[PDB]
Amino acid sequence: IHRTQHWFHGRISREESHRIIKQQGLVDGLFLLRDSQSNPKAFVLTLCHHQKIKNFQILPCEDDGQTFFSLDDGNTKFSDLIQLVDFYQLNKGVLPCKLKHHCIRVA
C-alpha cells in the first residue's frame, strides 16, 4: 500500500500541501500525493511547475471487481498509486511535466 510510500502524504489539506511544496523549493516536478478532501475514495497529485502548483484529482473506477485510478478521465488507468507514480515519473501525459522529486513528509 502507498501508506509506506515516501511521496504519499495522507490526509493533509490543499493549503498544507501548497505550503510544503513552497517550503521545499517550488522546483519543477516537485510533487506529492495525498487524500482528497472532496471524495473519500479519491486522491490528489499536487505538482509544481514553472513556480505554479497544480492539483490533479485521481479518481477510482471499478472494472470487474478491481479498482483502477486515473487523473485523465480514464485515458490512462493504474491498478494503484504506485503504478501511477512510476508512470508519471517516466511520461508527462497530461501533466505540465514529469514527476521528479517527492516532497518529504512533515510532522
Binding site: 490526509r11 493533509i12 495525498r34 483502477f68 490512462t76 488507468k77 491498478s79 508512470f87 517516466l90 513528509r105
Partner: protein, 135 residues
C-alpha cells in the same frame, strides 16, 4: 511498495497500423496494456486517435517500469467510431538494451466474429530520527 531492483524501463514506440480492416472510415487508436498474467492490469494507456485511416501513423512513445520476466503488454487497436481492429500480445523478454529497429507484428482476432487484418508496427527496447507516518 519499496523499489524493486529487478525492474527495467521499456521504451515502447507505437509507430503505425498497416492495412487495417466501403469508405474505410475507421478512426483507429491503440490501447496499450501493461499487465501481470497472475494479478492483472497494472497500467493501461490510450494513444491518440487518427481520423479516417486504415494506415494510421501514431508515432507515440510510452515508457513503462516493468518486470521483464513476468509482465506482458497487450496492444489492442480500436475504431473510435469500440470496434475491434486486432491485438498483439508480447512478453517483455528478451529485448535489446539501447539504433535497433521496429517489427511489424501480425494483428490477431479475439473472436470468431472478429475480422482483422494488417500489422501493428512497434519498437521496444530497454533503457540502459524517522519519517513521520501519513495522517
Amino acid at each position: 511498495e519499496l523499489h524493486n531492483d529487478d525492474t527495467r524501463v521499456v521504451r515502447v514506440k507505437v509507430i503505425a497500423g498497416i492495412g487495417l480492416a466501403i469508405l474505410g472510415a475507421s478512426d483507429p487508436y491503440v490501447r496499450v496494456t501493461l499487465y501481470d498474467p497472475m494479478s492483472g492490469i497494472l497500467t493501461s494507456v490510450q494513444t491518440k486517435t487518427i481520423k479516417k485511416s486504415l494506415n494510421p501513423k501514431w508515432n507515440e512513445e510510452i515508457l513503462f517500469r516493468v518486470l521483464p520476466q513476468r509482465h506482458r503488454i497487450l496492444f489492442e487497436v480500436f475504431d473510435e467510431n469500440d470496434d475491434f481492429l486486432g491485438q498483439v500480445d508480447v512478453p517483455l523478454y528478451p529485448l535489446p538494451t539501447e539504433p535497433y529497429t521496429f517489427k511489424d507484428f501480425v494483428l490477431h482476432p479475439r473472436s470468431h466474429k472478429s475480422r482483422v487484418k494488417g500489422y501493428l508496427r512497434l519498437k521496444m527496447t530497454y533503457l540502459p530520527t524517522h519519517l513521520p507516518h501519513p495522517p
